[PDB]
Design a protein around this ligand. Sequence first.
Ligand SMILES: *[C@@H]1O[C@H](CO)[C@@H](O[C@@H]2O[C@H](CO)[C@@H](O[C@@H]3O[C@H](CO[C@H]4O[C@H](CO)[C@@H](O)[C@H](O)[C@@H]4O)[C@@H](O)[C@H](O[C@H]4O[C@H](CO)[C@@H](O)[C@H](O)[C@@H]4O)[C@@H]3O)[C@H](O)[C@H]2NC(C)=O)[C@H](O)[C@H]1NC(C)=O
Ligand SMILES: CN1CCN(C(=N)c2ccc(C3=NO[C@H](CN4CCN(CC(=O)O)CC4)C3)cc2)CC1
Ligand SMILES: *[C@@H]1O[C@H](CO)[C@@H](O[C@@H]2O[C@H](CO)[C@@H](O)[C@H](O)[C@H]2NC(C)=O)[C@H](O)[C@H]1NC(C)=O
Ligand SMILES: *[C@@H]1O[C@H](CO)[C@@H](O)[C@H](O)[C@H]1NC(C)=O
Ligand SMILES: [Ca+2]
Ligand SMILES: [Ca+2]
Ligand SMILES: [Ca+2]
Ligand SMILES: [Ca+2]
Ligand SMILES: [Ca+2]
Ligand SMILES: [Ca+2]
Ligand SMILES: [Mg+2]
Lengths: 466, 454, 214, 216
Amino acid sequence: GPNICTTRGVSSCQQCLAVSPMCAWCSDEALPLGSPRCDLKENLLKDNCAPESIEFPVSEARVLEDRPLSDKGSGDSSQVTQVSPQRIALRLRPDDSKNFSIQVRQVEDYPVDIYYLMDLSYSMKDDLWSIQNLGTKLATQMRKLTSNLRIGFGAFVDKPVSPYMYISPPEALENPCYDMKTTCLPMFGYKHVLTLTDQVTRFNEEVKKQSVSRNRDAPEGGFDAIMQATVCDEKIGWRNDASHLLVFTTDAKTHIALDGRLAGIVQPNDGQCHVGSDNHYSASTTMDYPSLGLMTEKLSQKNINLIFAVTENVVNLYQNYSELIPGTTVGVLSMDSSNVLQLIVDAYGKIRSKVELEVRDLPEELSLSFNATCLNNEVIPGLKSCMGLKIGDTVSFSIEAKVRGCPQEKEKSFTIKPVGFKDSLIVQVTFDCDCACQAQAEPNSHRCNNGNGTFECGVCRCGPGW
Amino acid sequence: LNLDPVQLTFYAGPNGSQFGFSLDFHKDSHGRVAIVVGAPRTLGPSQEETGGVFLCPWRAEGGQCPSLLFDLRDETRNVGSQTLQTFKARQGLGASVVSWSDVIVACAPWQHWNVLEKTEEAEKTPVGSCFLAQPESGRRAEYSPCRGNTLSRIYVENDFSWDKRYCEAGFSSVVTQAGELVLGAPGGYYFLGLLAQAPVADIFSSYRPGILLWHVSSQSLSFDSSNPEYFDGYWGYSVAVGEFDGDLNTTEYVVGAPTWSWTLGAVEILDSYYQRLHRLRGEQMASYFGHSVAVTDVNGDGRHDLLVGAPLYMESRADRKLAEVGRVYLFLQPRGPHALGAPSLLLTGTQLYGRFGSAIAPLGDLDRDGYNDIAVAAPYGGPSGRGQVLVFLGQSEGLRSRPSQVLDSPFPTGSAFGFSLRGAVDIDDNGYPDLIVGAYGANQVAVYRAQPVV
Amino acid sequence: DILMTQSPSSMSVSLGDTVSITCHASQGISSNIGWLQQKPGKSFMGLIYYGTNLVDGVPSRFSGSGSGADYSLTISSLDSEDFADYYCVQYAQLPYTFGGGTKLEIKRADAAPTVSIFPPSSEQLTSGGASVVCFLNNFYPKDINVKWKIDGSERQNGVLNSWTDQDSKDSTYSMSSTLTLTKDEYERHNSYTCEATHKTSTSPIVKSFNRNEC
Amino acid sequence: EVQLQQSGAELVKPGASVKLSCTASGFNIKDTYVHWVKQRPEQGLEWIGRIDPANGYTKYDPKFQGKATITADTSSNTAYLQLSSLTSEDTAVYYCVRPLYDYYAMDYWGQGTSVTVSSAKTTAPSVYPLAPVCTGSSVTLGCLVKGYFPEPVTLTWNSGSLSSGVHTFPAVLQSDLYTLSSSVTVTSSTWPSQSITCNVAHPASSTKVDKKIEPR
Ligand SMILES: *[C@@H]1O[C@H](CO)[C@@H](O[C@@H]2O[C@H](CO)[C@@H](O[C@@H]3O[C@H](CO[C@H]4O[C@H](CO)[C@@H](O)[C@H](O)[C@@H]4O)[C@@H](O)[C@H](O[C@H]4O[C@H](CO)[C@@H](O)[C@H](O)[C@@H]4O)[C@@H]3O)[C@H](O)[C@H]2NC(C)=O)[C@H](O)[C@H]1NC(C)=O
Ligand SMILES: CN1CCN(C(=N)c2ccc(C3=NO[C@H](CN4CCN(CC(=O)O)CC4)C3)cc2)CC1
Ligand SMILES: *[C@@H]1O[C@H](CO)[C@@H](O[C@@H]2O[C@H](CO)[C@@H](O)[C@H](O)[C@H]2NC(C)=O)[C@H](O)[C@H]1NC(C)=O
Ligand SMILES: *[C@@H]1O[C@H](CO)[C@@H](O)[C@H](O)[C@H]1NC(C)=O
Ligand SMILES: [Ca+2]
Ligand SMILES: [Ca+2]
Ligand SMILES: [Ca+2]
Ligand SMILES: [Ca+2]
Ligand SMILES: [Ca+2]
Ligand SMILES: [Ca+2]
Ligand SMILES: [Mg+2]
């Protein structure tokens, strides 16, 4: 009987396919006048339509790249596969929908960068002492999780300018601890000390030569240091295919954007590297502290996992900041950093305990839906993220793409990528809205009103200008 | 709505002087309006930055302005077996400016100060200082309420109580109709923040050059605190005055504390005795809620309303993502003795890092409909990021949710167009209140003239 | 400590005169000096602070000046109330130190004193004491020297002198000298004299009496 | 208006102690420095020390280290000066001082508190008439008030009647006891024609003696 394909009374092959994903078009010449050309593929064959003249696209989804998931992230020149498949082809006719899957694994024995960024205001004098063997201790424990570890060190205090800095007497500049009975370093903003390296004894020996400084106000310029440790890629030495852990230790409040005006500083932070050959932050006294939003941007851009390792007296503070900077982890630090080792290990576990999908460059007319499978084959509808995972675990997601109508551009592509991951699933979409018979149309046909029309797919169409 | 964006007027100071960092309208004893302009990095005598002030006569063509001269020489006084010292290098004269009557008040928040007694010292610190001028008569005075002569050791013993050594007085400023100067000092009491008030008349009558340390008996300072909620709160980062207690004889203060309570931020309303009448807490940490405050009755009931700027507010967006755009809060004063409730309206910026709410200027009644209006700056807003100033009109129920007019910066990138604002004054005497906009990055000031509604 | 040498110790002047008091320090004090007024039998009033600045309420006819270690107080057109004590004080260094002081006195024509001697009363003699009194009333200038003589020979032990401030009426001065002896010692001698030396006479004004004799 | 209202005159014995007070009127004592100054006729003016009533820190001239002890109570809005182990040399007038504008100045002064140190007991005066010797147009009489303690004494003639033409000299300390005198001048036709009396009152011991001047 009649259906939406016929009852709509379409005018062409293109219009026929736009009715519904189930409609088909017969471009055969030998077709009765009363019989419609736009019907179910079954009904057309039933009416003796030539099988070759049947236009009926089917929405499909085939893989192009399907590398197997790596069992180990060790070895290789980063030929590690974390996502599978890596690339698929997607074909969709108007108002239709096709589905596909994706697998994501938290690969075992993946390389790791750890940059130790340390508050070295006066209260951290004791902390320096307890981490003099952190490099080797940390190596021993991380060896259980990875075979490619690199570590590095940086330190901060605050903007070396009044009123954060003591500027009298002249002695105080060289030795801020003059009015006490000790010596400390001249005040410094942020200084890089040790580029990421796998030679962990370098960490120990650099640390043993470090010492604290002293400044006036409780809040410190750590956020300056986080910014630089993030955007100075080559100096810090972050690797392309590795987890990036930025370990921030402090026992105090922090300066934030717009604080700088108390030092006469109004220039917004530009999010650029300003650490040169002297390994000190040169814009410390000229550029304001960075905003949370700008930090978030750069951390995300460089795939840095920030770890707030702070003392109990400011845990709530940094826990709250962490909520304004997604992907950030907080750990409770001892008054002498004696527990900083276990803190870093726990954080690394927490960091790799989550898989959260993200979409880039998704066309307007496309919408996606996600059904997740975390744990043991337990499906979770309307979810695109798993938690509570361990290293070596694997999760998968069912995805369905729904296109609205037919867009102008017939070929577009987007990306499915887990947060922080290197690999990703590229989806090459193709919008099959047209018919093949259109490619062989007869303009100014002598079948269509004395040349006043075009003959395509077995019917007459009004030409251009009409 | 009816500011003229076609024919602007441009004033300009020296390159690098940050001319336009602060500004205000000034009326001489005859009512002739001019523009006082602060230029906090203007060069001094020793070819060193000390800041400066300019008094711009009104001219449709604009151009260069004459200097309002102040003493830029460092001072020293050996008295009472001590040595008093002022340091004006990089003091930032003109980091704030305000006019009242025929008097101008220009401040240098980062003017430093020290006291030497033998081998000990008070420490060289930015107490800040304000300079007062009566341009017509040539009278000059100074006011630096945070200068002390206590030695460093003493503060240490008493755990830094009543420590005003880092006040940075003049960081913000305002003057009551009665002629009481109110200075914000965000570094007061070891960075809690304090307010210093004193009648302009008594400043002039009690000041003599060379004394450096003198008493202003009629002055009033806010109080220290041991509540950590106030620590590093920069109470006085911004300041304003208004009528909020229903007693027209008393003048209430509005104080911004953008890092109050571990950077939650706050704004407080106080009586003239610094007793707290209300507190508005920030909505989001590090948003700098209280960066700017504005008092004006926007809904025409005769009750002053309160606007607060949080230029770093991060608006929530799809996929659990935040976007720094800035926000402005409107608080309508309720009838009679009642607390200011929740905000009546939230205005939220659109441009990433735009810093919508960095400045908020009452315009008075721009379109002359009976309701006062405001201008909000986004110094790095607009599709180009060059800066934008948005106008919102008053109405019976508060403010309109959408702007009536948007002013795109005419200056290049980095001008900070809108960082400073001032309205509610008819400079060309055409019967419509006008707007002056500072762009210290370009060392210029733009004047937008209000015209009849079209 | 800083020594403050104030000069002159006193000056005799008239109404309308323009006068100047000076104050010299032992070292530079950079205008860290104040000037004070103390009207007769009353407290102090601030005149000048920091060298040249008038205290609130002080007339403009007063004025301070000078620098380094030499300063001056000037009063243009003296008023009847300006006749009083004046002091300088430095506060350049602790301890604060004051000047010797300067007293403004009313000037007038010279006038010789009216001398009058008085033997011991009968009452005092019966009690075992003996006081000879010698009044010297109404004279100008203030500078005067009294000398007691017993039997022609000078006596200095047991003399008690007292001077009055410049009289409000005639602007003259007066003095009272009293020689106290025991009853026994008073009768060892006969002649008792008090000699007055003033610039109004080269010859001293003598007045005396003889015991028993009358 | 700024006023410094000090305590009343003190009359104490050597070796004892006394505590003077300086109450602030029309302002808060805590606003400025408060100094103390000592005044004597011969020695003149001497700076004792200062206090900052806001915190109680003090400075002293080393000459007064031991005797002088300056304190302050913001509650009663008063400053104090304690003197100990008193001596005859501690007999002086004591002023409390504060500045007007200049932090270090000495502008506003109290009325001053008189202090007298002595072991003398309350002794009544000995009034003696002073008649001239056995001529001119003008005559002069006298009166001698000797050996009284403490001060003061009111002296008049004919009970306030004869006022003009009189010279009552300041008291003088004579061995822990005061001595005073007074002269009066009239015409020869007045005396001994008219009776002249020397009225002397000493409220301390409550005595009002009157001696009539008789010729010789
Ligand atoms: C890190 O971030 C957290 C989360 O915001 C902050 O914690 C909040 O701090 C505020 C301010 O102190 C607290 O405010 C108040 O809420 C109370 C209601 O409490 C209940 O509910 C929570 C669960 O959400 C329970 O934990 C709690 O025990 C209660 O069951 C009110 O009672 C309070 O009232 C009084 O004070 C306010 C001013 O704050 C007055 O206006 C009121 O009139 C009244 O007098 C108040 O409203 C809030 O409860 C806290 N939340 C949580 C979850 O702890 C941290 O402060 C922040 N830390 C740092 C360092 O930034
Ligand atoms: C009695 N009551 C005391 C507190 N009070 C204040 N107004 C007040 C508030 C805050 C502070 C400070 N916070 O922090 C600073 C401490 N410093 C320790 C050493 N640190 C060196 C370094 O870290 O390098 C820098 C930080 C000082 C001091 C005083 C009211 C009166
Ligand atoms: C997400 O999960 C839901 C189930 O919770 C899936 O939906 C059902 O899918 C079948 C497939 O044939 C339909 O017949 C049902 O009508 C659906 N039920 C609903 C929607 O309530 C859905 O397909 C999943 N999506 C993806 C992309 O896997
Ligand atoms: C398409 O969806 C169906 C049901 O949701 C599923 O069984 C099928 O495996 C999906 N196709 C692919 C390629 O995963
Ligand atoms: Ca520590
Ligand atoms: Ca700091
Ligand atoms: Ca009021
Ligand atoms: Ca209102
Ligand atoms: Ca309006
Ligand atoms: Ca106008
Ligand atoms: Mg610190």
